[PDB]
């Protein structure tokens, strides 16, 4: 195991109790580096390993679609973890008070947690460090190359982050070792019942008092991601590089909700893809999305504290947008109109309806749905707020570094370039509705999501 995957957050007095793994971003038993790093340090200490998950108070900021998808996987994870004699403990409340009290009550020896560059995670780490006296480590279990090792600074483009991540693939793209089993605070069903009950008033309903979310598209679970990845390699991998810009076809891997919650490892997906025989043009297209653009999103959120603000934009984009702030917008809609899909664009309305109904809108339409927010907002800062709101609320893969890096590109050209100067939008890359008609059947995408 590579010691570059682990980092030291706080040196402390080594206890004699079980090494506690604070699982958060990577909710899986297989291909979890942090779970394997926590098992080896537990073996060297002749002490059992225990995992802990914190159901935070901010779960009401999302919806039932994210609460049910994440809990259903944990109901499956508790079984698999018990098959290796690893008990799981699910605390409900603030991590700063729950982790520090659990470590003290159980005489923990070492604390381990997965890596997440989001601001809400660094908020929890700041609180737990002030109330613990044992060693505290963090492990990058999400990225193939550790986020602090792929680059020591923010990469302004994909062509400059590609040769750094690819040159480090021969060292970090490796097979996973077996999760050795151990030598020897309520039911998750009750947390789902009471949690959904508090989320029913804010459930996305239609006019007929019926909900919008269709929860039969992506079944959750670690075994569920096993079948989705196998179905993509066998059926959709050969045709990926040619129909990934066509939202009328379901030609994507559909692994993003399993990737966000950590129910599947991107390293495991790359391993099976790299050994699969298919079109080299389609293989390069998928690896560039799951390796480059995915791990550069963690690069954007790690080295830019204001990743969700106007200040993280490139210097050319801030000057371009500022030079067009006072331009008369074509039309201005409110958050309630963008949320209900009540605009003058049927293609945009169809992209919002797919976001409302499935919780996973096509990748190409995500670029159109977010850029049109900037064209129909009072200011770039308002377009950022509206885009991040509708993304984090309805996307099953929402509240992920991929979203903020994808939103900062549509509204601020992050990891892009300067194009022709237009009004309102400035030099940000513009995508027209007529340009989408010559790209795919827009009429089929609209009629599909009435």
Ligand X SMILES: Cc1cc2nc3c(=O)[nH]c(=O)nc-3n(C[C@H](O)[C@H](O)[C@H](O)COP(=O)(O)OP(=O)(O)OC[C@H]3O[C@@H](n4cnc5c(N)ncnc54)[C@H](O)[C@@H]3O)c2cc1C
285 torsion bin: left (phi>0), alpha (psi -120 to 50), beta (else): alpha
Position 370 contacts ligand X (CB under 6 A): yes
Query: Closest separation between CB of residue 244 and ligand X, Å?
Result: 6
Given candidates 65, 121, 244, 268, which one binds ligand X under the rule CB under 6 A?
244
Q: Which two tokens stand for residue 50?
A: 């225990």
Helix (H, G, I), strand (E, B) or coil at 106: coil
Given candidates 307, 397, 413, 428, which one binds ligand X under the rule CB under 6 A?
397
CB nearer ligand X, residue 403 or residue 426: 403
* Helix 266-275, helix 222-231: angle, nearest 10: 30
CB nearer ligand X, residue 117 or residue 403: 403
CA atoms of 150 and 168, how far apart (whole Å): 7
Position 430 contacts ligand X (CB under 6 A): no
Given candidates 63, 241, 247, 403, which one binds ligand X under the rule CB under 6 A?
403
- Site size toward ligand X (CB under 6 A) is 27
Candidates 71-79, 125-133, 202-210, 247-255: pick the segment binding ligand X (CB under 6 A): 247-255
Site for ligand X in 188-217 (CB under 6 A): none
What is the number of other CB atoms lying within 10 angstroms of the CB of residue 421? 12
Given candidates 402, 416, 426, 436, which one binds ligand X under the rule CB under 6 A?
402
DSSP states of 272-329: HHHHS---HHHHHHHHIIIIIHHHHHHHHHHH-TTTTSGGGS-HHHHHHHHTTTTSPP
- Binding residues for FAD, by number, are 240, 253-256, 289, 360, 366, 391, 397, 402
CB nearer ligand X, residue 108 or residue 251: 251
Query: Closest separation between CB of residue 251 and ligand X, Å?
Result: 8
CB nearer ligand X, residue 51 or residue 396: 396
CB nearer ligand X, residue 231 or residue 322: 231
Helix (H, G, I), strand (E, B) or coil at 400: coil
CB nearer ligand X, residue 101 or residue 162: 162
Position 73 contacts ligand X (CB under 6 A): no
Position 395 contacts ligand X (CB under 6 A): yes
CA atoms of 344 and 332, how far apart (whole Å): 11
Which residue in 424, 402, 263, 414 sits closest to 331, CA to CA? 424
CA atoms of 54 and 184, how far apart (whole Å): 25
Position 65 contacts ligand X (CB under 6 A): no
Cβ(67)–Cβ(55) below 8 Å: no
Position 406 contacts ligand X (CB under 6 A): yes
Backbone angles phi, psi at 23, to 5 degrees: -70, 140
CA atoms of 15 and 136, how far apart (whole Å): 12
CA atoms of 52 and 138, how far apart (whole Å): 14
Given candidates 24, 32, 267, 297, which one binds ligand X under the rule CB under 6 A?
297
Burial grade of 189 (CB within 10 A; 0-12, 13-18, 19 or more): exposed
Cβ(377)–Cβ(412) below 8 Å: no
Given candidates 128, 400, 415, 431, which one binds ligand X under the rule CB under 6 A?
400
Query: Closest separation between CB of residue 369 and ligand X, Å?
Result: 6
Position 253 contacts ligand X (CB under 6 A): yes
Position 149 contacts ligand X (CB under 6 A): no
CA atoms of 386 and 335, how far apart (whole Å): 6
Position 165 contacts ligand X (CB under 6 A): no
CB nearer ligand X, residue 98 or residue 399: 399
Candidates 21-29, 32-40, 141-149, 391-399: pick the segment binding ligand X (CB under 6 A): 391-399
Q: Which secondary-structure segment (H or E) carries 240?
A: helix 240-243
Position 308 contacts ligand X (CB under 6 A): no
CB nearer ligand X, residue 72 or residue 415: 415
Position 63 contacts ligand X (CB under 6 A): no
Position 391 contacts ligand X (CB under 6 A): yes
In order of 24, 138, 175, the CA distances from 37 in angstroms are 15, 10, 15
Q: Which secondary-structure segment (H or E) carries 22?
A: strand 19-23
Position 238 contacts ligand X (CB under 6 A): no
Site for ligand X in 256-275 (CB under 6 A): 256, 259-260
Query: Closest separation between CB of residue 290 and ligand X, Å?
Result: 4
Residues lying near ligand X in the complex (CB under 6 A): 244, 252-256, 259-260, 289-290, 293-294, 297, 363, 366-367, 370, 391, 395, 397-398, 400, 402-403, 406-407, 410
């Amino acid at each position: 195991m590579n010691p570059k995957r682990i980092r030291a957050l706080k040196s402390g007095k080594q206890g004699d109790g079980p090494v506690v793994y604070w699982m958060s971003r990577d909710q899986r038993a297989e291909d979890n580096w942090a779970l394997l790093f926590s098992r080896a340090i537990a073996k060297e200490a002749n002490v059992p390993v225990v995992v802990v998950f914190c159901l935070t108070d901010e779960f009401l900021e999302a919806g039932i679609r994210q609460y049910e998808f994440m809990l259903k996987g944990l109901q499956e994870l508790e079984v698999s973890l018990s098959r290796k004699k690893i008990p799981s403990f699910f605390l409900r409340g603030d991590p700063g008070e729950k982790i520090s009290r659990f470590v003290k009550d159980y005489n923990a020896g070492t604390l381990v947690t997965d890596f997440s560059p989001l601001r809400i995670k660094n908020q929890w780490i700041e609180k737990v460090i002030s109330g613990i006296s044992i060693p505290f480590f963090e492990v990058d279990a999400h990225n193939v190359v550790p986020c602090w090792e792929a680059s020591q600074k923010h990469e302004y483009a994909a062509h400059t982050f590609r040769p750094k991540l690819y040159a480090l693939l021969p060292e970090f793209l490796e097979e996973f070792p077996e999760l050795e089993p151990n030598s020897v605070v309520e039911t998750l069903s009750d947390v789902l019942e009471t949690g959904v009950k508090a989320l029913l008033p804010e459930r996305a309903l239609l006019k007929n008092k019926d909900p919008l979310f269709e929860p039969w598209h992506f079944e959750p679970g670690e075994k569920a991601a096993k079948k989705v990845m196998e179905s993509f390699i066998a059926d959709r991998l050969d045709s990926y590089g040619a129909l990934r810009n066509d939202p009328t076809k379901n030609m994507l891997s559909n692994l993003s909700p399993y990737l966000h919650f950590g129910q599947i490892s991107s390293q495991r997906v790359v391993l099976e893809v790299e050994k699969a025989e298919s079109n080299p043009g389609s293989k390069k297209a998928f690896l560039d999305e799951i390796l480059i653009w995915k791990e550069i999103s963690d690069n954007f959120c790690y080295y830019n504290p204001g990743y969700d603000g106007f200040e993280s934009f490139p210097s050319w984009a801030k000057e371009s947008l500022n030079a067009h702030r006072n331009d008369v917008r074509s039309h201005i809609y409110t958050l309630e109109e963008f949320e209900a899909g009540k605009t003058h664009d049927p293609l945009w309305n169809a992209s919002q309806m797919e976001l409302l109904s499935t919780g996973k809108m096509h990748g190409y339409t995500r670029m159109y749905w977010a850029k049109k927010i900037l064209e129909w907002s009072e200011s770039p800062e308002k377009a950022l707020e509206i885009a991040i709101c509708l993304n984090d609320r309805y996307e099953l893969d929402g509240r992920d570094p991929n979203g903020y890096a994808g939103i900062a590109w549509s509204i601020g050209g992050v990891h892009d370039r300067a194009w022709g100067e237009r009004e309102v939008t400035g030099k940000i890359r513009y995508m027209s509705y007529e340009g989408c008609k010559r790209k795919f059947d827009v009429k089929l995408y609209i009629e599909k999501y009435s």
